[PDB]
Every structure is written in C-alpha cells, then in structure tokens.
Symmetry: C3
Subunit: 334 residues, 3 copies
Amino acid sequence: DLKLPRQKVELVAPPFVHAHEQATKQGPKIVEFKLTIEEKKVVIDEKGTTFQAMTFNGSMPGPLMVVHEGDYVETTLVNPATNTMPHNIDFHSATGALGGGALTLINPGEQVVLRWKATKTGVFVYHCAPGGPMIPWHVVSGMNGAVMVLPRDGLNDGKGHALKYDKVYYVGEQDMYVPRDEKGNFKSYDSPGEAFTDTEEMMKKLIPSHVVFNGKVGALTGKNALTANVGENVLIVHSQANRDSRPHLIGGHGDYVWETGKFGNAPEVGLETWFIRGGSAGAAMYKFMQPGIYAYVTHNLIEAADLGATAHFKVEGKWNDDLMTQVKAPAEIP
Amino acid sequence: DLKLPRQKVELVAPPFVHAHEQATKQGPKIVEFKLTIEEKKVVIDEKGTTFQAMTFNGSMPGPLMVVHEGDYVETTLVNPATNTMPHNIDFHSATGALGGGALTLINPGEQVVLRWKATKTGVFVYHCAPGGPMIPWHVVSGMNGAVMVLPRDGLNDGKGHALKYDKVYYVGEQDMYVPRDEKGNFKSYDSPGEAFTDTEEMMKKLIPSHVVFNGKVGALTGKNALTANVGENVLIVHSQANRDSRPHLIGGHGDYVWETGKFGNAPEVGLETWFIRGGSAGAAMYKFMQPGIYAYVTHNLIEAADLGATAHFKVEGKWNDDLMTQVKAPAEIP
Amino acid sequence: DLKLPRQKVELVAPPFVHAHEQATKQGPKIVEFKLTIEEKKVVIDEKGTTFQAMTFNGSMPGPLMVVHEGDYVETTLVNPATNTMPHNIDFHSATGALGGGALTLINPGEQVVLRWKATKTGVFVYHCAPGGPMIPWHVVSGMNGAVMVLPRDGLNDGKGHALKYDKVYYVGEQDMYVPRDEKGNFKSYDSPGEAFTDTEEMMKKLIPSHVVFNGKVGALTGKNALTANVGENVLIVHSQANRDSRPHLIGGHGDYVWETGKFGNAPEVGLETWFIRGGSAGAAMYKFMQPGIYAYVTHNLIEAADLGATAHFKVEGKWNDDLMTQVKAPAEIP
Ligand SMILES: OC[C@H]1O[C@@](CO)(O[C@H]2O[C@H](CO)[C@@H](O)[C@H](O)[C@H]2O)[C@@H](O)[C@@H]1O
Ligand SMILES: OC[C@H]1O[C@@](CO)(O[C@H]2O[C@H](CO)[C@@H](O)[C@H](O)[C@H]2O)[C@@H](O)[C@@H]1O
Ligand SMILES: OC[C@H]1O[C@@](CO)(O[C@H]2O[C@H](CO)[C@@H](O)[C@H](O)[C@H]2O)[C@@H](O)[C@@H]1O
Ligand SMILES: O=N[O-]
Ligand SMILES: O=N[O-]
Ligand SMILES: O=N[O-]
Ligand SMILES: [Cu+2]
Ligand SMILES: [Cu+2]
Ligand SMILES: [Cu+2]
Ligand SMILES: [Cu+2]
Ligand SMILES: [Cu+2]
Ligand SMILES: [Cu+2]
C-alpha cells in the first residue's frame, strides 16, 4: 500500500548517535530500524554492585533513533528465546495503540514489525510497557531510549535563524532500585524474576539507590568522557522515562534549550539548569567558549555526586581570559 | 453596591464539568456557587483500604467552577454541624485575604458568603487552609478542587486562531498518606481527628501511600472511563494542590498545553508529557486521531501503575493505518 | 590588561539586596565583591535544633550580588584560618573552569581573586563545590547564594514595555538534613566534620528534615516579615541550589515570572505557582492590590507548614472591595 523509498539505519550505542542529516532535501521515506531485547545481569557502580537489567540492543539507554517529520518509522522488535519475559515497545512520538505497545507484545522467541508516521517533531521517549505493574518494572530495569524527529529544514531559534549542531550526544538517565539486605549491602539476584518482589517493594517507596547516565556510575568519564572543541555547537539530548531530572553543564550554559523537548516550540535561551519531566526527553545546545573539564550533572547534587549522575566533557582549545581569569592565585590572607 | 445580573450554577461531580459557554457575548455577572463540606470515611483502593476524607461537595477533587474573566464569583461555603472541624476556602484565582481563607473560616454549624472578582484567566486551584499544620492536612485529606476562568472570546493558540473544545474533563490528582501498622497493613481510623497524629508523622516524610485520580484507584476506568470519538477536541484540566505531577496521554499527545495553566500565555504545542506544579492546575487539549483505549497517567510509572494514578479513555472511530500499522504480527524469529 | 573603572559593592544580608540601578547609562565596569566564609553552629527551628552551617558572609543564603550585562565581576573569596575545611566558589553565571570552582579552591588561611565577565542575563546560583561528595555536603550545609545580571536597559515584558520594580527581595531556600538519634530527637554535633558521616547517610535518602527560607524556620516572619504597600511592584528572587521548589504568594499572583530565571526570555504572566529547578534561581514580580498579611510559600504545603518553608509579607494600604468582599460573615446555617 505505502509505496515510498526504504532506508536502513545502523543503530549505534549511546551516547553516540547514528549518522543523519539535519536539514534535508529528501522527501518522506520508510526508515527501518531493528531492536533486539537483551535481559542481562550488569555491574552499575565502581564497588561492583550488580543489577538485573532489561535492555533494547544491550544498552541503557536504548539507542537514539533519528528521523525527519513525515517519515514512516518501521521497527522490527526481536525478543530472543534466551530471554524470560514478554516485552513490547511504546513510542511517545507515535499516535494510537498505546504508542505501539498494544501491537508489539512478543514472547521469547518472537518478533513483530510496527510502522508509525512521525507527525510530531522533537525528542521523545520510547519504552517497554507490557501491562500493569510490569510497566514501571521494565522501564526502571533499563527498557527505555529515545527518538528524535527533526524538521526537514533542520532546527531554528524561533527568531527565522537556523541552529545547526556540530555533534549530538544522547544522555539517558536511569533511576535504579537495588534492595539492601539486613547488613546494609546491596542484594544480588539470579534472574529478573527473582529480583522482582524485593525490587517492587523498594520502587513503591519512590527513592532510587542509584541514578546513572549510560547505565553505570562513571560511564561517561575518563576514556569515555564526552568531547568537544572551543567553537563547537553540541546538542545534548537528555531523557528520563520515569523520574524528573534537572540537567546542568557545570562551567557552561544551555544556549538554546527545549526542556519539554518539542521543536514546534521555540527554544529558551541562556539557561543555567533545565528540567526534564519524568516520561520525556529534552534537548539543549551549547557552543563551547572555554577549554578544560566540564561536568554534566543533574543538579540535585546528592544524586550527581553520591548516586551516580555525573558525566564529563573534555574540551580542547584556547583559554579566554576575557571571559574568566584568576586575578590572584591562592595566597595567605594579608 | 454591585448591581450586576446574578446567575446560579448547578455544580456537577468530577470528572464532568457544569455546562458553560466558551466564547460569550455576555458581560460580567455575579455567578453564584454553593459548596457544602463533607467529612467522611471512604474506600480508596480495590483492596478495601479506608481513608478519612474531607471534601467540598462530597467529592475528591471538589467540583470545577467555570466563569469568565471579569465575572464576580459568589460562593456560599457551608460547614454542617455533622462535621467535626473548622474549614475555610482559599482560591488561587482571587486577590487578597489569603485567597479568601482569612474571610471564610467557619465552624460546624456555620456558613459564609465570599465574593471575588475573576481578574486572572486560566485554571486555578482552590483548597481549604484553616491555619498552621492544619493547612497541609486538610488539603491532603481531599479538600481541594479547581476553578477555570475563561477569556470572553474563548481560548486561542497565541498564533490569532481560536481553540474550541468539544468537551472538557477535570482530573484532580490526590496524594494520600495512609499509615501502616507493625504487620505492614494500612491502618483504619474512627475519625479524622484520630487519624491526625499518625497521618502527620507520615506526611512529613513526603512519600504518599496512594496517588489517585478522582478519589480512588481505578475511579476513571471501566464504566467510568473517559470517552471521546476520533475527531473530537478534548480539554483535560489537571490539578494537584500539594505535589508535582507529570501528565501523559499514552498513545496521544498534548496538542496545545498550558502546563502552568494560565491563558494569558500562549500554549505550547505537541508535547509528550507536561508538568503540573504542586499547588497549581494546568490544561491540555488533544484532538483524537485513533480509536481504542488510551491511558492518562502521571508518568512516574510507579505512581501510575502501583500507587493508583491511571485513568482510561475509550475512543470510538475508524483506525488510521497511515498513522500506525502492525506490518507483521508476532511470529517466530526466522 | 583590562582597563575599566572599578566599583566596590557593600553586600548586605538577605533578604535585602544592595543598592543598584535597574536601567543604567553606565558602561561596563569591574565590580568588586568580597565574600568571607564562615563555618558555624546555628539554630534552625523554634524548638532549638542546631545545625552545622557553612556560609558565605555568615548568612544562608549568601548575599545577592547585582551587576549588569557586560560587567566584570571580581570576587575576593576569603577562607579564614578559623575554618576547618577547604572551600571554593562556582558561579552559574560564569563561563569556564567549572564556573570558577577550578580556580578558587582555598585552604583555611588563604584567599583568592576571581574575575568573570557577565555575558548572560538573569538570576543565577552560586555555590561552593570543592570536589566529589563534598560538593552536595557543602551546598546543603548552606554554601550557596545568587547573582543577578540585569540588562543595561532594565527589565522588559517581552511585549517592548519596561518592567520596573520598586523593591527586590532575595528568598534563598535551603533543604537541610539533620539526623535523628534512636529516641527520635535531632542530633547535635561539635564540628562539621563530626556531622559528616550521619548527615551523608541521610542526604542519600533524599528527604530533608527541614526546608527553610533565610536559614531558619520563621526567619521571614514577625518583625522580619517582608513588607510592601498597595501599588508597589516587588521583585522576588528565589533560589534553590539542590532541590526543586514551587513558590506561591498566598492571596496574590506572579504578574510577571521568569521561572527559569533568565531575562533573555520573556516572562510568563498571571501565574498562581511557579517552579524553581534545583540548581537555579528564578524571579517573579507582583504589584500588590490588597493590604494585609500574605504568606510566601513553597506549595508543597507539608514543606511550607511543617518543615519551615513559609515567609510573610505585611502590606499596608486600602482594602479593595471590588476585588474581594465578605458578602455575609459567618452565621448559623438557615
Ligand atoms: O522554533 C519554533 C517556533 O518558531 C516559529 C517562529 O516564531 O516558527 C518557525 O518554526 C516553525 C517550525 O519549524 C516553522 O514552520 C516556521 O516557518 C518558522 O517560522 C514559531 O511559529 C514556532 O513556535
Ligand atoms: O494565547 C495568548 C497569547 O496570544 C497573544 C498573541 O500572541 O495574544 C492573544 O491572546 C490575548 C489573550 O487572550 C488576547 O488579548 C490577544 O488579543 C490575542 O492576540 C499573546 O499576547 C498572548 O501571550
Ligand atoms: O523579554 C525578553 C524577550 O523580549 C523580546 C521581544 O519579544 O526582546 C526584548 O528584550 C531583549 C532582551 O532584553 C531586547 O534585546 C530586545 O530589544 C527587546 O525587544 C524577545 O526577543 C525576548 O526573548
Ligand atoms: O554482554 N556483554 O557484552
Ligand atoms: O456518602 N455516600 O454517598
Ligand atoms: O555569629 N553570630 O552573629
Ligand atoms: Cu520489557
Ligand atoms: Cu510512556
Ligand atoms: Cu478543611
Ligand atoms: Cu494554595
Ligand atoms: Cu565549602
Ligand atoms: Cu551548580
């Protein structure tokens, strides 16, 4: 019925994003994506705490999918027989059938193919949502990512000027609920099913044990710091499928920010901290002015420093003494 | 002194809203409303947990009051002798005297009549606020609702175009604090006064036991699902008098959203999830494009699925395969 | 190198703000400020609970610094030898070096001088951030304040009209974490270092024991109520360095509100409640229309009434019966 050109995308693991055009002369296409569910025990902190994760494509978050307004997104969702539970997918970008969830419930050993038209621009969450109490559990176990639906003319500032990024990163924040035993040590479990009772009891108390970017404390640090150069315009897409977050670039700003994440609305300018509503993605762009280390955090600083929610940028370039200078180094008080 | 026409309104129980005009050729009127306080033990979940509720007009939330900018709202507040506590009313829409609270404190057996001019457009909370520690307790016991103050020309998109809804629903979200005994079972109490000590101790820890729409788990489901048809523009007014919420229509969008709830500001467009600040009401409109079941949730999914904060819409009409289609049903992996 | 005129500012304790111009014919200057760190045990509630505070200039919050866009802000930070810990300062308004923190780490007995150019307009947090787990601890111990960077033409409504305030107040909200002993009584400690272990364990659970304005329950009440007169336009700057807040003026409104706090964006109009993201400052202006007592709260009413987060305004002037009137005083029900 639908006779449009087909284009396959090779998804890449976060925080990177598959290659795409911003402004495009292409017309609508059917863009084809594949997600393969993986349930797996992973390590989430530098002390070796383990977690029963459930993921799209083996990562937390799931990969960022990028399309343009009016494209048709055709996803093959695969639930291999090596998994234990049914799963599905719900796209906040899509219209009808609970975002697709009512059409994609698959048991281990099955796959399904869903197509939806990208009628709404912005960044959007996608997540598993099998039904009932399983919905929060699968999401907070890691089964969420995001999609970005660009205008065909690319981004603008609302005020007819184009806003072109040099690079884009996707920072998926995950609230995790790991129960503790009587000693006060984090518990380990042999299966997601076995983790369920204790994990649900903790979840209902609403306080996470960990809040992490890219699946683990320190994931986006050291060798895996985010990078930029002075003069580069970087777009940071930030999602949180269950709980609020308040992103902040320490030493920088959000030059243009869509905190509700939707490109039909003009961005706000010159923010210090912005707010990602639980169940949403937002986006912020910043042109780096200074070299050095920056930290990208949620600005609940307890969560950032003590629960895991800190990434770093390492930025190359020349220091600008007009913008900031140490007039007098630390010295004894006169 | 004030010589304007008087109009009586028959309030209706949420989620329905009393009949009103959007755009009107009427001039200012004195619009007359009556609220009768009822303290009552109610059931809040499908397991039979009870709660000592305090309500305006017998409902949680209290009913939605609808007027137009420049009307005078004249409320008779009635506290029958069958109640145990003093009560009052504070309207966020009103100016002076703590929103009216300083002029409406009434003991059991008394009534009072307050008039305020509707100078600010939008949706606003109203709530009881007797003084001191009683303020949070009365609010989280159920004593809150909302008022909607429409422009006389009706709603607009900010961009000179009219925005007319086919129907309006009021979803009042309530955070409830029910203490547990040593066993781990929810406690029942013989009076609001007897529930006070244990309830205050829990309240100060800031974690609700239940988060519900329209007073109970499952209230807006089954026979009491919200309804629409494909092609209908529905306005959903959402209030939360004490705690933040993040509304989301699963399978839909907020086509036009006033998340801070005030019609002097243009709506945002094409949202996935929006944010209702504790102590406020907001409003979102959506034109349904697909038939079927939708869930309307706060997108803290633990609260939605496990604590009570899910409503359903049942929508009639024709499925649109252009917008979404199951290209291949669940099948064994090749 | 930088040859501009120098101007010294005498900082004043919150909620007051040092004298400044709104619109100015001055060009860029180097504006000189001094902050002296003080670690001190203070009383935070009317029951006599004590707290190991860490402050800029002896106050919580630290004082508001006011400059204009394109000024250079030169701060001398002083850490006297009477303190026990290293400290630094990070300005969200500044660009590079973690907001200045990477250039201002000072041991007891040292001082440092930092200059930054005020390229971004709005209200911004400043806070200490020494590194690692110390970052949240120093902030929630009191080491935060705000700076306001005004346009040189003063404030505007976005719609070419000027917005001039008659007075400005700075309300700094502090979430505090005071542990309890087995009895259930709040603990007292002999030093910040001794309070650290118990305080960090509580902090990671994310629930404060107290939420206060200006450092203490009841600080901005009685003799220290905020004041205004009918007809006065008051700007209220509100900051929260770690945790969200939802300000509300009971009996009033936010006539013009920058809830993300940045003057490059037009204000929203006619709000009931606004939202300050943890790690940010915002600002709201209101022209008083009625005399009497107003309460300024966070509209989590449990926090406001039970945890400490209430200020009062006492307003002088003539009551306006058109806006609100008690039509019939409390009487027996007919
Ligand atoms: O940035 C979106 C914002 O900008 C405005 C102009 O104020 O419209 C621009 O963006 C639209 C969506 O990309 C374009 O269709 C339009 O042509 C362009 O002017 C606003 O209408 C919009 O909210
Ligand atoms: O939607 C409100 C938003 O729209 C604007 C136009 O951009 O003004 C419209 O709405 C006002 C309030 O209803 C009307 O008085 C006005 O005539 C109309 O253009 C904005 O000014 C406003 O913020
Ligand atoms: O209030 C800021 C908001 O107003 C606009 C006009 O809609 O610009 C005004 O404010 C700018 C910043 O102060 C001035 O430079 C400009 O000249 C003035 O019109 C918007 O552009 C801005 O977002
Ligand atoms: O599953 N580990 O690559
Ligand atoms: O009070 N029950 O209808
Ligand atoms: O330290 N007291 O003024
Ligand atoms: Cu799943
Ligand atoms: Cu969802
Ligand atoms: Cu009451
Ligand atoms: Cu209120
Ligand atoms: Cu410090
Ligand atoms: Cu900071």
